[PDB]
Design an enzyme around this catalytic site. Structure first.
Site, PDB file in Angstrom:
ATOM      1  N   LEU A 186     -18.824   4.866  28.993  1.00 43.63           N
ATOM      2  CA  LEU A 186     -19.543   3.597  29.035  1.00 43.63           C
ATOM      3  C   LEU A 186     -19.698   3.028  30.436  1.00 43.63           C
ATOM      4  O   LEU A 186     -20.764   2.504  30.766  1.00 43.63           O
ATOM      5  CB  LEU A 186     -18.837   2.560  28.151  1.00 43.63           C
ATOM      6  CG  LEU A 186     -18.738   2.844  26.650  1.00 43.63           C
ATOM      7  CD1 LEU A 186     -17.922   1.760  25.959  1.00 43.63           C
ATOM      8  CD2 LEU A 186     -20.118   2.955  26.023  1.00 43.63           C
TER       9      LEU A 186
ATOM     10  N   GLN B 101     -17.903   2.788  34.821  1.00 50.66           N
ATOM     11  CA  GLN B 101     -17.020   3.265  35.875  1.00 50.66           C
ATOM     12  C   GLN B 101     -16.736   2.135  36.854  1.00 50.66           C
ATOM     13  O   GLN B 101     -17.449   1.129  36.901  1.00 50.66           O
ATOM     14  CB  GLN B 101     -17.621   4.460  36.623  1.00 50.66           C
ATOM     15  CG  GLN B 101     -17.508   5.777  35.889  1.00 50.66           C
ATOM     16  CD  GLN B 101     -18.217   6.900  36.618  1.00 50.66           C
ATOM     17  OE1 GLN B 101     -17.703   8.015  36.714  1.00 50.66           O
ATOM     18  NE2 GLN B 101     -19.409   6.613  37.129  1.00 50.66           N
ATOM     19  N   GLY B 102     -15.682   2.320  37.642  1.00 53.64           N
ATOM     20  CA  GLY B 102     -15.279   1.335  38.629  1.00 53.64           C
ATOM     21  C   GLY B 102     -14.449   1.922  39.753  1.00 53.64           C
ATOM     22  O   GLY B 102     -13.238   1.714  39.818  1.00 53.64           O
TER      23      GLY B 102
ATOM     24  N   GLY C 211     -11.037   2.764  37.356  1.00 53.36           N
ATOM     25  CA  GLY C 211     -11.011   3.709  36.254  1.00 53.36           C
ATOM     26  C   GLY C 211     -12.336   3.820  35.527  1.00 53.36           C
ATOM     27  O   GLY C 211     -13.397   3.612  36.118  1.00 53.36           O
ATOM     28  N   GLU C 212     -12.276   4.152  34.238  1.00 50.86           N
ATOM     29  CA  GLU C 212     -13.466   4.274  33.410  1.00 50.86           C
ATOM     30  C   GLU C 212     -13.193   3.660  32.046  1.00 50.86           C
ATOM     31  O   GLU C 212     -12.042   3.433  31.663  1.00 50.86           O
ATOM     32  CB  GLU C 212     -13.900   5.737  33.256  1.00 50.86           C
TER      33      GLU C 212
ATOM     34  N   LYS D 154     -10.022   2.010  27.968  1.00 43.42           N
ATOM     35  CA  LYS D 154     -10.015   1.897  29.419  1.00 43.42           C
ATOM     36  C   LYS D 154      -8.973   2.849  29.992  1.00 43.42           C
ATOM     37  O   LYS D 154      -7.810   2.829  29.576  1.00 43.42           O
ATOM     38  CB  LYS D 154      -9.721   0.461  29.854  1.00 43.42           C
ATOM     39  CG  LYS D 154     -10.697  -0.563  29.301  1.00 43.42           C
ATOM     40  CD  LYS D 154     -10.389  -1.958  29.815  1.00 43.42           C
ATOM     41  CE  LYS D 154     -10.556  -2.039  31.323  1.00 43.42           C
ATOM     42  NZ  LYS D 154     -10.383  -3.434  31.818  1.00 43.42           N
TER      43      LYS D 154
ATOM     44  N   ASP E 254     -11.721 -15.478  35.982  1.00 52.11           N
ATOM     45  CA  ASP E 254     -12.979 -14.811  36.304  1.00 52.11           C
ATOM     46  C   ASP E 254     -13.921 -14.889  35.104  1.00 52.11           C
ATOM     47  O   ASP E 254     -14.443 -13.888  34.623  1.00 52.11           O
ATOM     48  CB  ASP E 254     -12.743 -13.368  36.742  1.00 52.11           C
ATOM     49  CG  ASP E 254     -13.990 -12.726  37.318  1.00 52.11           C
ATOM     50  OD1 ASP E 254     -14.917 -13.466  37.711  1.00 52.11           O
ATOM     51  OD2 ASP E 254     -14.045 -11.482  37.377  1.00 52.11           O
TER      52      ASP E 254
HETATM   53  C1  GUT Z   1     -21.646  -6.573  32.289  1.00 51.38           C
HETATM   54  C2  GUT Z   1     -21.642  -5.037  32.246  1.00 51.38           C
HETATM   55  C3  GUT Z   1     -20.429  -4.502  31.463  1.00 51.38           C
HETATM   56  O1  GUT Z   1     -19.458  -5.221  31.229  1.00 51.38           O
HETATM   57  N1  GUT Z   1     -20.540  -3.215  31.081  1.00 51.38           N
HETATM   58  C4  GUT Z   1     -19.548  -2.589  30.419  1.00 51.38           C
HETATM   59  C5  GUT Z   1     -18.717  -1.744  31.150  1.00 51.38           C
HETATM   60  C6  GUT Z   1     -17.689  -1.055  30.518  1.00 51.38           C
HETATM   61  C7  GUT Z   1     -17.486  -1.186  29.147  1.00 51.38           C
HETATM   62  C8  GUT Z   1     -18.305  -2.014  28.384  1.00 51.38           C
HETATM   63  C9  GUT Z   1     -18.086  -2.124  27.053  1.00 51.38           C
HETATM   64  C10 GUT Z   1     -18.971  -1.914  26.059  1.00 51.38           C
HETATM   65  C11 GUT Z   1     -20.254  -1.515  26.034  1.00 51.38           C
HETATM   66  C12 GUT Z   1     -20.906  -1.549  24.803  1.00 51.38           C
HETATM   67  C13 GUT Z   1     -22.226  -1.128  24.670  1.00 51.38           C
HETATM   68  C14 GUT Z   1     -22.908  -0.644  25.780  1.00 51.38           C
HETATM   69  N2  GUT Z   1     -24.178  -0.228  25.677  1.00 51.38           N
HETATM   70  C15 GUT Z   1     -24.752   0.607  26.757  1.00 51.38           C
HETATM   71  C16 GUT Z   1     -26.235   0.351  26.940  1.00 51.38           C
HETATM   72  N3  GUT Z   1     -26.948   0.389  25.656  1.00 51.38           N
HETATM   73  C17 GUT Z   1     -28.381   0.196  25.917  1.00 51.38           C
HETATM   74  C18 GUT Z   1     -26.457  -0.720  24.823  1.00 51.38           C
HETATM   75  C19 GUT Z   1     -24.985  -0.552  24.477  1.00 51.38           C
HETATM   76  C20 GUT Z   1     -22.262  -0.584  27.007  1.00 51.38           C
HETATM   77  C21 GUT Z   1     -20.943  -1.005  27.127  1.00 51.38           C
HETATM   78  N4  GUT Z   1     -18.360  -2.120  24.903  1.00 51.38           N
HETATM   79  C22 GUT Z   1     -17.109  -2.469  25.148  1.00 51.38           C
HETATM   80  N5  GUT Z   1     -16.134  -2.784  24.280  1.00 51.38           N
HETATM   81  C23 GUT Z   1     -14.873  -3.132  24.744  1.00 51.38           C
HETATM   82  N6  GUT Z   1     -14.683  -3.139  26.121  1.00 51.38           N
HETATM   83  C24 GUT Z   1     -13.347  -3.497  26.659  1.00 51.38           C
HETATM   84  C25 GUT Z   1     -13.194  -5.004  26.858  1.00 51.38           C
HETATM   85  C26 GUT Z   1     -15.697  -2.813  26.949  1.00 51.38           C
HETATM   86  O2  GUT Z   1     -15.465  -2.840  28.156  1.00 51.38           O
HETATM   87  C27 GUT Z   1     -16.913  -2.477  26.477  1.00 51.38           C
HETATM   88  C28 GUT Z   1     -19.337  -2.713  29.038  1.00 51.38           C
END
Ligand code: GUT
Length: 246
Positions: A17, A19-20, A21-22, A37, A118
């Site tokens: 989903l 990167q930064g 970990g992943e 994470k 934040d």
């Molecule tokens: C503001 C950008 C951001 O926060 N991106 C992000 C980075 C890492 C993890 C997550 C994330 C997501 C997540 C859900 C759905 C999507 N999509 C990708 C693009 N298509 C078009 C739509 C769906 C991307 C990322 N779901 C998550 N659930 C839990 N966590 C932990 C708190 C996540 O980080 C997370 C988003």
């Protein structure tokens, strides 16, 4: 080490989903979809927080590679949600409700005597049915006393919430448009506050300005913000009319 531990073999990583970990989407055991994470301070904070509007901690793996298993939010971060195809169709009722959920989560944080530090659209996650949840436990989003003197409190989070209200009502635009960090800091300390977004009712901008009061103890509580936003279209704007964008 503690009761949040799980066997790593019980996790299956399916899609990457970010990167930064992943961060990965996967399956826990064979039944539950999770976000993984791939540092402990964040988990330790979540271990004590359990609320419907906070991304829930599921499990943890303490042996390297370290994992933090969490609730999966299907729609990504609020910032990207607002800026994508959805933004053009969201109107004030949906954005105020979304803000209401965020304040509900922060009202819980407030009751537990925690600070986020934040808060902003990029650290809210969105699910189905417009569910929003606070996650990820930025000068333009930071209160002056925190940015200048490191005084982070629940009242600096309320300041941040005020900025996040501008993100919602502009559907993802950067605060203080056209201003760089140093100019925001100089201008805010001199009393500048962002004006009323286009089509945003004055009553909502008044709420912003209250979050932006100089004295942090005069900023409202999140409890207050949640009730005000939940009741908004009955108690405050009972004659709301859709506009061109809000
Ligand atoms: C503001 C950008 C951001 O926060 N991106 C992000 C980075 C890492 C993890 C997550 C994330 C997501 C997540 C859900 C759905 C999507 N999509 C990708 C693009 N298509 C078009 C739509 C769906 C991307 C990322 N779901 C998550 N659930 C839990 N966590 C932990 C708190 C996540 O980080 C997370 C988003």
């Amino acid at each position: 080490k503690d009761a949040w531990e799980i066997p790593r073999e019980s996790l299956r990583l399916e899609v990457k989903l970010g990167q930064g970990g992943e961060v990965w989407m996967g399956t826990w055991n064979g039944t539950t979809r999770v976000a993984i994470k791939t540092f402990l301070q964040e988990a330790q904070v979540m271990k004590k927080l359990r609320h419907e509007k906070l991304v829930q901690l599921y499990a943890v793996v303490s042996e390297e590679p370290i994992y933090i298993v969490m609730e999966y939010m299907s729609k990504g971060c609020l910032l990207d949600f607002l800026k994508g195809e959805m933004g053009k169709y969201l109107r004030l009722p949906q954005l105020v409700d979304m803000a209401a959920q965020i304040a509900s989560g922060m009202a819980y944080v407030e009751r537990m005597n925690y600070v986020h530090r934040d808060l902003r659209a990029a650290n809210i996650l969105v699910g189905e049915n417009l569910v929003c949840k606070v996650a990820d436990f930025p000068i333009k989003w930071t209160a002056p006393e925190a940015a200048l003197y490191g005084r982070f409190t629940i009242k600096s989070d309320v300041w941040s919430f005020g900025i996040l209200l501008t993100e919602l009502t502009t559907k993802g635009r950067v605060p203080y448009p056209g201003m760089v960090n140093r100019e925001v800091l100089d201008q805010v300390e001199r009393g500048y506050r962002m004006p009323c977004p286009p089509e945003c009712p004055e009553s909502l901008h008044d709420l912003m300005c209250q979050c932006w009061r100089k004295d942090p103890e005069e900023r409202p509580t999140f409890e207050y913000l949640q009730a005000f936003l939940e009741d908004y279209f009955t108690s405050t704007e009972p004659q709301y009319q859709p506009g061109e964008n809000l």
